[PDB]
Design a protein around this ligand. Structure first.
Ligand SMILES: N[C@@H](CCCC[NH3+])C(=O)O
Ligand SMILES: N[C@@H](CCCC[NH3+])C(=O)O
Ligand SMILES: [Cl-]
Ligand SMILES: [Cl-]
Lengths: 485, 479
């Protein structure tokens, strides 16, 4: 079937090469289908007689999506990047080019010039004075669900409503940059290859620089490089770019993902939360015109102030059998974990156990936007310890519809404290932990030069785009998501 | 003697921890030194009496850069992200905080509040009414690339380069967005490395048991978007080259790539010189720049010069017939002492002669056009002489700044060029491209005729900031 159609289109191309240049590049496109549809949307004012009288001429090109051959005259529909428009073709006007049109195929790229009119059913149409083939298609367009991702180039053609998700993705990132730029944050670029993978607990990709005989790591986060800039005196910086994770086969998580990270000297996690909900809410209003969105069935409103809820309080609310004393009591939390069927390791302190209970019993219930605050120090190796209870850190994670969207904290700038935590992570990696951090001596050295007290932030841009576009799957907001071979 | 200095500072930190929270984070910085200097630059209006009388109070923090103790009174200088300002400290006003200040070290991060004044020497100064230590420094200030975090401190002039770099990229995005190009993100890991002749980094996805390549270019993914009908796209992001040891080159570098359906290299050259010129005006206020001792004017229309004519101008021994005669070009190469390879056809030999005798003479902005097909595997062949392609490279001050062409959209031609590349990759060419059957498939669905472009962002920033080394426009260059 399909292999027969392809051969037939190659025979058409073979005859095309004998008549001349089969792939010409000398057509200047000037007009866009969607801009014309908007300009002439009022069919009461722009009747067929009005459009023909106006004398407007257009010069367009697009992919041939449909043909209606009536005999001496035909209709066609083309699609460019902005939308679709009808064409009206008359053999008495177009002559040999009308004969050519009858032989073209859906998928061919054609160019057309002419005036405007409106069909009997109200559709804006080009009255074609001249028409020509620019690119012969050799593969017919489709009339599995994984082919939309292994062939994004096909799906953008036949599901053109998906284009709007990617356009909005671009507007979201641009709105975020304007919001930050207007607040005098400096956008910076830091390396994507690191000597030591740091700044997140994730398994990295490794690569090799052959000339230097040097192993390198694709970054899991830019955090430790960005705080070196804070030390240097770039006191308000951000970066929006890729991180890399070398983890399990997942349909919900891509090995490449886009994060915005930001560092503001002299802020705490209180001000960083303010900033986080401010930029998310304002970007939502800029690209959607309001603060409400429907995501995965949930009706989310970003307008009201986000909730701020301690992790231990949220755990106790959802686990009434846990007392306030139990929250820092490792033996009590083991009992609850066993009771909740939560697999535990012997290296887990009370803080890790509390996080496990939070993940199993709390986080799926956080639908409306909620900052969960004050994470235990055991699970927060880069966050500043709280002044009043050093078993906790001044940290937060933002959840929307049960999903983590951002995380930030008052930054640990005490080099001796940071070195100690680095050493506990090196001890944790020896116990079979593939995600424990490494000791980065050069970063300790930067902190020894002195870093201002600072607040830092990461926003998951892909999940932010999923939320604001109402996309349930990561694969709908990435142009080329990774697919298994 | 530095390790003893570190020990003394650590002892000071120990005493600090004994007195309270040594690393506090409860200071809300409100004012910036560089903005106060601008606001009060007019010392005729803003005498000491007018500053002290206006009642302005500031609240700022910065790194302690200098101290001058004069008994009961002292001067100090601090530096934040915006510049430097002087502090005036009186023991009669600050009490115990003055005693603490005399113990502080250059490099410490401190916070201060007070009014403003001006010294006898005309310097804007904060009359400190309250001062406190936020971060004790443990390492004395003295590198430039091994410790950018030190050089940004003591060479604050370098900050302006990186600020201007961010403004250049921002102005480029605005110029392209205002012309309805869509900024996209394509993968940085590829199944097949393509889009440039460069040795790639390889990595491995463990769970999928699959080898991947860090991209040398996004080109083949961007053109798949053209096929999909995203007809005006651009991307500004990293490429990765696993090349040899070089101080002039960095294994990571930033490129802007753009694809415009229904353009040729003529219109892409128009676009290229327009965006460069307009971005220069936006960040520099004009079109002239001094770069590595050369005075460059981006204002006039860029020269457009064929490669073969430029070669013959600088090598008059080379005839018109010679330019497509492999044996004649081999003789010229030997006479010019250019080392070459037996697999080089006339087109590659012409490029080698261009690189050796022409490229370094191209000071004022010059598009060199019409590259041989042998060295242009993704460029559309010329309709009248298919030994050449409709391609250009932009040179300024002897350096390549951009490259673009009318795009090859003929899938059968593209597959043949890939097949020649594969034969070379088996002949000992680590930079020969691979066959990408999925890209060919996308072209078989049909791509509009298209023009494409790559601009070297790092070199553009070097040009527009007058920086002679790429290490001066990269925050963390590879060392
Ligand atoms: N590095 C963090 C984001 C910033 C956290 C605050 N310093 C992450 O990967 O999620
Ligand atoms: N991929 C090219 C830039 C685009 C050329 C036009 N398709 C490069 O790496 O230089
Ligand atoms: Cl042809
Ligand atoms: Cl302390």
């Amino acid at each position: 079937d399909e292999n027969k159609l392809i051969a037939e289109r190659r025979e058409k191309l073979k005859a095309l090469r004998g008549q001349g240049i089969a792939y010409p590049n000398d057509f200047r496109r000037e007009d866009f289908a969607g801009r014309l549809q908007e300009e002439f949307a009022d069919a009461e004012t722009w009747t067929a007689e009005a459009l023909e009288g106006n004398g407007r001429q257009v010069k367009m090109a697009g992919r041939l999506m449909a043909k209606r051959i009536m005999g001496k005259a035909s209709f066609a529909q083309i699609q460019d990047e902005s939308g679709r428009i009808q064409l009206f073709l008359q053999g008495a006007v177009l002559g040999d080019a009308y004969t050519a049109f009858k032989g073209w195929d859906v998928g061919d790229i054609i160019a057309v010039e002419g005036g405007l009119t409106r069909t009997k059913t109200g559709e804006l149409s080009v009255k074609a004075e001249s028409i020509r083939l620019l690119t012969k298609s050799l593969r017919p367009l489709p009339d599995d669900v994984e082919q939309r991702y292994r062939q994004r180039y096909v799906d953008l053609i036949v599901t053109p409503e998906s284009r709007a998700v990617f356009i909005k993705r671009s507007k979201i990132i641009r709105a975020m940059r304007a919001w930050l730029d207007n607040r005098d944050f400096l956008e910076v670029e830091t390396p994507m290859m690191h000597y030591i993978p740091g700044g997140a607990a994730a398994k990295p990709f490794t690569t090799h620089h052959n000339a230097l005989d040097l192993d390198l790591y694709l970054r899991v986060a830019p955090e430790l490089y960005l705080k070196r800039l804070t030390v240097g005196g770039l006191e308000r910086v951000y970066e929006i770019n890729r991180n890399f994770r070398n983890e399990g086969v997942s349909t919900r998580h891509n090995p490449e993902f886009t994060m915005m990270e930001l560092y503001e000297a002299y802020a705490t996690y209180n001000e960083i939360m303010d900033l986080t909900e401010g930029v998310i809410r304002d970007v939502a209003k800029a690209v959607n015109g309001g603060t409400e969105v429907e995501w995965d069935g949930a009706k989310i409103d970003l307008g009201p102030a986000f909730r701020r809820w301690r992790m231990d309080e949220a755990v106790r609310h959802h686990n009434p059998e846990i007392s306030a004393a139990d929250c820092t009591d490792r033996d009590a939390l083991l009992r609850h974990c066993e009771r909740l069927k939560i697999r535990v390791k012997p290296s887990y302190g009370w803080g890790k156990l509390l996080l496990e209970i939070f993940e199993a019993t709390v986080e799926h219930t956080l639908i409306q936007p909620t900052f969960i605050t004050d994470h235990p120090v055991e699970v927060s190796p880069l966050a500043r310890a709280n002044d009043n209870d050093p078993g906790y850190t001044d940290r937060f994670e933002l959840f929307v519809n049960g999903k983590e969207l951002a995380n930030g904290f008052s930054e640990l700038n005490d080099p001796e404290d940071q070195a100690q935590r680095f050493q506990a992570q090196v001890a944790a990696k020896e116990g079979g932990d593939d995600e424990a951090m490494h000791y980065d001596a050069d970063y300790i050295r930067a902190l020894e030069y002195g870093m201002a007290p600072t607040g830092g932030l990461g926003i998951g841009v892909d999940r932010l785009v999923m939320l604001l576009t109402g996309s349930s799957s990561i694969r709908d907001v990435l142009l080329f998501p990774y697919m298994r071979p």
